Amino acid sequence: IVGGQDATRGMFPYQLSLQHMGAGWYHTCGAILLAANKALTAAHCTEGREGFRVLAGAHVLPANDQEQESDVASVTEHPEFDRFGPGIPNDVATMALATAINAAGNVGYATLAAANAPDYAGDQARLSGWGKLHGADDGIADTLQYVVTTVRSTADCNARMPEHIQNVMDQHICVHSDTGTTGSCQGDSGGPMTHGASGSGNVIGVTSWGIGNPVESCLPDFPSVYARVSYFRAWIDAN
Amino acid sequence: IVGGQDATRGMFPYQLSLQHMGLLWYHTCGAVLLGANKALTAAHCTEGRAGFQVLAGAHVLSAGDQEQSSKVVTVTEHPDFDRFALGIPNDVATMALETAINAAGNVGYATLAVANAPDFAGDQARLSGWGKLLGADDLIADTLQYVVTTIRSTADCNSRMPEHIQFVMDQHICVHSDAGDTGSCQGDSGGPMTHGASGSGNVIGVTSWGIGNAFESCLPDYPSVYARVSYFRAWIDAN
């Protein structure tokens, strides 16, 4: 998260750390807790890989301070996900959890946007995650971050993109500040966009992509693009 | 190298594999043999690191049958190298070798561009190295690659970049194919750009940077950017 600040523990009860087994476990993406044995993330976070765990109720990743955890037993990526397609289409996946994660302590389940939700253009929303604090940094964040930003319409999103990368679609929900100073970054992918500037809010997006250059991987000068939960809600529910 | 083919051993007599000691030795960058005890690479290949060796007259890395090698005693990075500044300026370094490497067999010393050399805009050139064969691949190349491409002027270079990445400078030399299919890739940094499409050619650039995204780390749809040897020749000779 670029341009944000430390969250407090429990501020995003459904925020997960999605961990991949390399040499040992490492944070690769965010994820979103939906139910005791179900979670939601970006398809690109799991596609082509195997060996995952989610941490629930965590705050400072190097402290190993999670409250609950479960192995991921199975993953369903959207069948029309295309890692290399314009706009990274259909960048959503559900995950089945081996062990139940209970709504307790600082852990809780997200309320997803309804399929008939409005598009929220102009609304304040929050991005959260352990992604890099700046696109040039070599490491991800130690402490969970969040930032308040503004949802834009599809047309507005594309107007804010590079001229040859006008690939934002209605299946996306994009945020951008008018100062060009906040956004998501590597390590935030698969996490939640929470509606509203404060308090409890529905989860309306899943972190997916943004724009970089050779010295800064996630430019707040350009929007951050999420998979739109209302567009994918029926599919998420069916999978 | 993207869009290229297997080279032959000795095709580029001055091409080195710059190895870094981690778990075991591994290829981290290219380098360019300048003389019996001296090599050239990119500053970002050596800055902040130590414990290097160069392999000369190599071909297939897994074969381990380079003709000659040497540990590196010390490295010197350009004093104005800036990994964060637009254009990653001054990305050159020299290296002193513990063991003399002879010009013999498939190993020879580069002829560097003189400081009076022109821009070479429009000319063909060759890129060589063990970088990845595609930006979406996980691993570097096993067999040394090369590709023929076309040198572009500073202004033409920038015209072929994204509008928010107009970072090419006169201290760079860039190459780009109109078909958008050739370029350097991670693992190629530090290696040579050789003037001309065939024959003995002077070394006119050092591999430095290119455009990527989170799923494809090098994009031949945009130019590949090298440090221009003519610009840096006096520094290289003195260091």
Author numbering:
A (entry chain B), B (entry chain A): 1 to 239
Direct quotes from the study:
Here, we introduce a small facultative plasminogen-independent thrombolytic enzyme, snFPITE, isolated from Sipunculus nudus. Compared to traditional thrombolytic agents, snFPITE does not require plasminogen for thrombolysis, although its presence enhances lytic activity. Native/SDS-PAGE, high-resolution mass spectrometry (HRMS), and ultrahigh-performance liquid chromatography (UHPLC) unveiled that snFPITE was a small monomer protein with a molecular weight of 24.925 kD. Mechanistically, snFPITE activates plasminogen and degrades fibrin(ogen) in a multisite cleavage manner. snFPITE is inhibited by plasminogen activator inhibitor 1 and α2-antiplasmin via a competitive inhibition.
Moreover, snFPITE-n2 consisted of two molecules (A and B) in an asymmetric unit. snFPITE-n2-B (molecule B) was the same as snFPITE-n1, but 28 amino acids differed between molecules A and B. These two molecules formed a heterodimer through hydrogen bonding with two separate catalytic triads available for substrates, indicating that snFPITE-n2 could function comparably to snFPITE-n1. This unique structure of snFPITE-n2 might shed light on preventing the loss of activity through dimerization or polymerization during freeze–thaw cycles. Prior to crystallization, the protein samples were treated with the serine protease inhibitor phenylmethylsulphonylfluoride (PMSF). This treatment facilitated the clear observation of electron densities corresponding to the PMSF molecule covalently bonded to Ser189 of snFPITE-n1, snFPITE-n2-A, and snFPITE-n2-B within the PMSF-snFPITE-n1/n2 cocrystal structures. High-resolution crystal structures of both snFPITE-n1 and snFPITE-n2 reconfirmed that their catalytic triads consisted of His44, Asp91, and Ser189, and the weak substrate specificity might be caused by Gly183 and Ile88 residues in the binding pockets S1 and S2, or the four additional residues (Cys, Leu, Pro, and Asp) inserted into the S1 pocket of snFPITEs. The presence of snFPITE-n1 and snFPITE-n2 implied that more snFPITE sequences might exist in S. nudus.
